[PDB]
Design a protein around this ligand. Structure first.
Ligand SMILES: *Cc1c(COP(=O)(O)O)cnc(C)c1O
Ligand SMILES: *Cc1c(COP(=O)(O)O)cnc(C)c1O
Ligand SMILES: CC(C)CCC(=O)O
Ligand SMILES: CC(C)CCC(=O)O
Lengths: 302, 302
């Protein structure tokens, strides 16, 4: 078996200290326990596997893959490209942290640093230029249906099975939209009453009808509505503040032994609010995108 | 289920690029995919669980636990103490990196920084002083039999089962001695011919009859022979150099998509040497103690 085969089948834990008696149960699926360190291992593998199935790629070919990202998707893609023999090029703003750059380069990914003032725009443009110039494959994480399918076929079934089909609400901090759409659809097809609640930063609350903005929940809240997000599935949207989520993330670590990432703090905070609304006999399920290992130099744990 | 229940059942992957046709198969068990980030999650939980079973501890009591360590054992203990409600105090040299200190404090562990010039000695002395003063419980990782039992009951069975009882040699970089002793005994009780090979830093080659010394394989090669290491099980000892292991660790990341820790580089390098000796139709199994996530600031990936 290769590393791609080590992706998935992550555990789900029930919170016991940060919750209160008047709350529904709160379960958290730990996606940080993936070989790539995050939930992105799933869509990264699925988008590449889907490309191989469609004949766009053939493993061990040295074919070029390009994607504008330096986040978890970049790490997941780098891991898979290293394992399956593809040349990966990732575009990203020049202001990227040395830490992240080191992880990506460790996997052999080639990095192209773009205009720091043009943020994501310059990164997207360079990726498109390379795709055109090299005839490369671009996963296109925000609109590739294979992203959603990864969660519809693995993440969803796993969560459903682990919780024995008993879930009253599913809460998630949306990024590409793949997870909430894939898991949400899978759950709603089986649980008539289940509620699917999206979580987004109050500082970049576009799903709530607000405006995009800079925020600290790395990995979620892209500032736009991605094609992979099926709004028709949503039963609500909860806005979260770092001021509330970071202290909670620290409590999770000190009280539950759960050392999670920045987005996890926001997601769990939201899950607690939903748990209080539903009450004692209910069950709220949510997912922790990644662990705290990559954020020791951030205000979350610094 | 709580975080302690998320420990174990880690995957095993077969190397495909760094190996050669004239080598036996080389399988690597990824212990970095544990909630605490390393194989130490197992002995940490087992030593505490064993203490509860013997009546020394009762969870949720706020009882004090003290151990002289800032390594993976400290992280594993911190995680369990946070989850089960114990007050954890870890002693360590004052020259400890801020990164590690941040992880430990995230879990709520109390840190006592001791004389930087007295290395581990001052740390051990302060831990003993606290045990005495507070009547605290000290796991005592190098001599506690529960450490070994964790691997005899979980790590060993898992590896054996995953490889369908077909293992010709088991290779591991010894630290406390728990893993090689526990897994080694489990395997030798079932596989008559299996060879158990220990790995140690050439720079601190005490098992080979050499002398202790400073080295870069964090987590292994303590510079002494621990009580938990059963020398009678060993069929050999392989000395490894960072000069050889670090480049290999980088190849594993770029070619196998396996981003592993410093000790993993030394262990896999040794496993390759054994694989070449055994040949094509054989199987060599080894374990990766942790991932590369904690070593981005080291010469391995910096
Ligand atoms: C990818 C990611 C998310 C969002 O998951 P999507 O399926 O992309 O919606 C949230 N947090 C982190 C840290 C992520 O990497
Ligand atoms: C604990 C550890 C080891 C050694 O395992 P033992 O069972 O203690 O022999 C090796 N490498 C790392 C990184 C470790 O944390
Ligand atoms: C989900 C998005 C906000 C970020 C994807 C990434 O580059 O990891
Ligand atoms: C195995 C030993 C060399 C180190 C144990 C630790 O403190 O993590």
């Amino acid at each position: 078996m290769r590393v791609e085969g080590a992706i998935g089948k992550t555990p789900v834990v029930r919170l016991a200290k940060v919750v209160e008696p008047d709350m529904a149960e709160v379960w958290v699926k730990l996606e940080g326990l993936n070989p790539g360190g995050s939930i992105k291992d799933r869509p990264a593998w699925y988008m590449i596997k889907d490309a191989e199935e469609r004949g766009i790629l053939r493993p061990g070919s040295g074919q070029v893959i390009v994607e504008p990202t330096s986040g978890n998707t970049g790490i997941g893609l780098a891991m898979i490209a290293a394992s399956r023999g593809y040349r990966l090029i990732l575009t990203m703003p020049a202001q990227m942290s040395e830490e992240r750059k080191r992880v990506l380069k460790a996997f052999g990914a080639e990095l192209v640093l773009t205009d720091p003032e043009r943020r994501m725009l310059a990164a997207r443009e360079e990726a498109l230029r390379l795709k055109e110039e090299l005839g490369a494959f671009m996963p296109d994480q925000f609109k590739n249906p294979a992203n959603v399918r990864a969660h519809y076929e693995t993440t969803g079934p796993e969560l459903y099975e682990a919780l024995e089909g008993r879930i009253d609400a599913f809460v998630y901090g949306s990024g590409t939209g793949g997870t909430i759409t894939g898991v949400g659809r899978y759950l709603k097809e089986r649980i008539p009453h289940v509620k699917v609640i999206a979580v987004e930063p109050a500082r970049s609350n576009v799903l709530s009808g607000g405006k995009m903005g800079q925020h600290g929940f790395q990995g979620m809240g892209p500032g736009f509505i991605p094609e992979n997000l099926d709004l028709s599935l949503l039963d609500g949207v909860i806005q979260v503040w770092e001021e509330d989520a970071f202290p909670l993330a620290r409590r999770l670590a000190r009280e539950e032994g759960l050392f999670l990432g920045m987005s996890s703090g926001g997601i769990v905070w939201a899950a607690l609010q939903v748990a209080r609304e539903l009450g004692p006999g209910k069950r709220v399920a949510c997912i922790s995108p990644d662990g705290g290992w990559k954020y020791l130099s951030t205000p979350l744990y610094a």
